[PDB]
Paper text:
We determined the crystal structures of PfDPMS in complex with metal-bound nucleotide (GDP•Mg2+) and donor (GDP-Man•Mn2+). The guanosine moiety of GDP is located in a pocket formed at the C-terminal ends of the parallel β-strands β1–β4, where interactions are offered mainly with the β-α loop regions. Guanosine interacts with the protein through several possible hydrogen bonds: guanine O6 – Gly68 N (β3-α3 loop); guanine N1 and N2 – Asp39 OD2 (β2-α2 loop); ribose O2 – Tyr10 N (β1-α1 loop); and ribose O3 – Ala90 N (β4-α4 loop). In addition, the guanine ring stacks with the hydrophobic Leu69 side chain (β3-α3 loop). The diphosphate-binding site is formed at the canonical DXD motif located in the β4-α4 loop, which is defined by DAD in DPMSs, and forms the inner wall of the diphosphate-binding site. Asp91 and Gln93 in the 89DADLQH94 motif coordinate the α- and β-phosphate groups of GDP via the metal cation: α-phosphate O2A – Me2+ – Asp91 OD2, and α-phosphate O2B – Me2+ – Gln93 OE1. The active site in the catalytic domain is gated by a flexible loop (residues 202–210), which we refer to as the acceptor loop, or A-loop. In the PfDPMS•GDP•Mg2+ and PfDPMS•GDP-Man•Mn2+ complexes, the A-loop is closed and folded over the diphosphate-binding site to create an outer wall (“front door”) of the active site. The conformation of the A-loop couples to donor binding through a network of interactions: GDP α-phosphate O2A – Arg202 Nh1, and α-phosphate O2B – Lys208 N. The A-loop is further secured by ionic interactions: Arg202 Nh2 – Glu12 Oe1; Arg202 Nh2 – Oe2; Arg202 Nh2 – Glu206 O; and Glu12 Oe2 – Lys208 Nz. On the other side of the donor pocket, Phe177 assumes a conformation that together with complementary shielding from the A-loop prevents the donor from leaving through a “back door”. The PfDPMS•GDP•Mg2+ and PfDPMS•GDP-Man•Mn2+ complexes are very similar with only minor shifts in side chains located in IFH1 and IFH2, which do not interact directly with GDP or GDP-Man.
An integral membrane protein, Dol-P-Man synthase (DPMS; EC 2.4.1.83), is responsible for Dol-P-Man biosynthesis by catalyzing the transfer of mannose from guanosine diphosphate α-D-mannose (GDP-Man) to dolichylphosphate (Dol-P). High-resolution crystal structures of wild-type Pyrococcus furiosus DPMS (PfDPMS) in complex with donor and acceptor substrates, as well as with Dol-P-Man product, were determined. The overall structure of PfDPMS features an N-terminal, cytoplasmic catalytic domain covalently attached to a TM domain with four TM helices (TMHs) arranged as two TMH dimers, TMD1 and TMD2. Besides the TM domain, two IF helices (IFH1 and IFH2) are appended to the cytoplasmic GT-A domain in PfDPMS.
Residue numbers in the entry: -2 to 352
């Protein structure tokens, strides 16, 4: 069936010795199929391009050398432009991504998926000779993305450099050239209705230096922020804060009104805070999250109370921990309120108004 064309897009910087092994294993994996290899090199101080062309004698290789541009994601964007296939396959050149699982990726695509992700973290997925710490940092960084970007909440390895997609997913789509995690750009901005993750083993690099470890983490966080903006999450967070501010005023307002009407201070606090919660739910339901209301309004009201209570607990615990660590009580209090707001937003975004 793969009379349809497959383009294997490979970004390279100083990837030399690996090419011979790479192309060999790729060809054997994709034996007899209509495929091309598209190498995108940013004028390596390295011979290859050169080695690439030479294997063009034996392998269907298209070589793109760019002198004006640098960057991993930028190269992949270039690959999409230069590729002529119906299905794109993106992978590294160092054999950490095994060419032998490419058939499973394209098979998923033929079976009806728009994107097939080579994933280290779904059932079956593994990583080879990783220290436990590095594995934590990885899944920890991934967790941040899944929570901050609800669209990829259920993706286990959204930062993978190894994936396949129908050309339709990214044609007509403007992808941001900055960064490394091109898949995350695609998951957010691409056109698709079905993604699957396919387990594989992230193997040992065989030969050559590493060019990205570690130069990725704070870029990754700025990438997340750009995507939060794009998704309207930043907008929701600002509106949520504004509502939250109004709630503080409403709380103090009723507290004053109640005690001056002959109601004891430590009795008046209860209706005052509950009214502030009701106030906060109301504006968030008709403004902040108006477009993603589901089910009964009472069910949302109850979930909102859970988030509000969770916020108060986080605020309490954070404050005292910081006080025990020797932090000034005003800073401690500030951080408590900020983390409370953060937790309340996350719980309301993922539970009260879940998507
Ligand atoms: N074209 C291009 N390729 C890059 C760039 N940075 C990294 N790569 C390629 O991306 C692939 C994976 O990079 P690698 O160093 O193995 O990342 P690591 O697995 O985290 O160590 C390799 O084939 C590199 O050649 C870049 O700036 N431009
Ligand atoms: C879960 C939140 C992700 C952390 C965001 C890290 C990037 C912050 C730097 C981007 C600059 C933001 N700003 C407001 C100055 O434009
Ligand atoms: C807390 C200071 C920040 C200023 C924001 C004050 C609330 C702005 C509400 C604008 C919404 C009005 N409108 C018509 C768009 O619904
Ligand atoms: C469809 C209308 C959307 C609601 C308009 C904006 C509601 C903001 C109400 C809270 C702001 C109160 N305060 C004190 C900050 O001005
Ligand atoms: C059964 C005891 C309940 C203790 C929990 C107290 C909840 C405090 C909620 C504070 C939120 C008020 N405000 C103005 C920030 O919305
Ligand atoms: C919705 C509750 C608000 C009702 C009226 C609130 C009156 C505002 C407080 C007036 C001044 C209070 N204080 C302590 C500064 O004197
Ligand atoms: C931010 C937490 C500090 C709030 C101070 C007042 C707390 C008094 C108990 C509030 C109980 C809230 N509610 C609605 C569950 O009753
Ligand atoms: C991991 C949860 C941390 C619990 C924080 C414990 C707070 C202890 C505060 C003690 C000071 C208050 N007081 C009035 C009893 O002195
Ligand atoms: Cl709230
Ligand atoms: Mg590598």
């Amino acid at each position: 069936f793969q009379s349809m064309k497959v383009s294997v897009i490979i970004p390279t910087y100083n990837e030399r010795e690996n090419l011979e092994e790479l192309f060999s294993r790729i060809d054997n994996a994709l034996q007899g199929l209509n495929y091309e290899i598209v190498v995108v090199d940013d004028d390596s101080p390295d011979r290859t391009w050169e080695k690439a062309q030479e294997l063009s004698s034996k392998y269907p290789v298209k070589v793109i050398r760019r002198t004006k541009e640098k960057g991993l994601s930028s190269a992949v964007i270039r690959g999409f432009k230069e590729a002529s296939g119906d299905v794109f396959v993106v992978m590294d050149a160092d054999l950490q991504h095994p060419p032998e699982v490419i058939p499973k990726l394209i098979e998923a695509i033929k079976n009806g998926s728009d994107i097939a992700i080579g994933s280290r973290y779904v059932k079956g997925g593994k990583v080879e000779n990783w220290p436990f710490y590095r594995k934590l940092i990885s899944k920890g960084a991934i967790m941040v993305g899944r929570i901050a970007l609800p669209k990829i909440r259920d993706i286990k390895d959204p930062v993978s450099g190894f994936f396949a997609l129908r050309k339709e997913v990214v044609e007509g789509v403007e992808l941001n050239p900055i960064g490394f995690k091109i898949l995350m750009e695609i998951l957010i901005k691409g056109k698709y209705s079905k993604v699957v993750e396919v387990p594989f083993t992230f193997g040992i690099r065989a030969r050559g230096e590493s060019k990205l470890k570690g130069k990725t983490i704070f870029e990754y966080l700025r990438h997340i922020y750009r995507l939060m903006k794009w998704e309207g999450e930043i907008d929701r967070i600002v509106k949520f804060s504004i509502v939250g501010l109004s709630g503080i005023l409403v709380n103090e307002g009723f507290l004053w009104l109640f005690v001056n009407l002959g109601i004891p201070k430590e009795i008046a606090v209860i209706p005052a805070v509950e009214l502030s919660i009701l106030n906060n739910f109301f504006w968030n339901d008709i403004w902040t999250f108006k477009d993603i209301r589901r089910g009964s309004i009472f069910s949302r009201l109850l979930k909102f109370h859970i988030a509000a209570l969770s916020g108060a607990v986080v605020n309490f615990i954070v404050y005292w921990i910081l006080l025990f660590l020797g932090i000034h009580y005003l800073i401690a209090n500030l951080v408590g309120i900020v983390l409370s707001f953060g937790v309340r937003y996350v719980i309301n975004r993922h539970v009260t108004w879940a998507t």
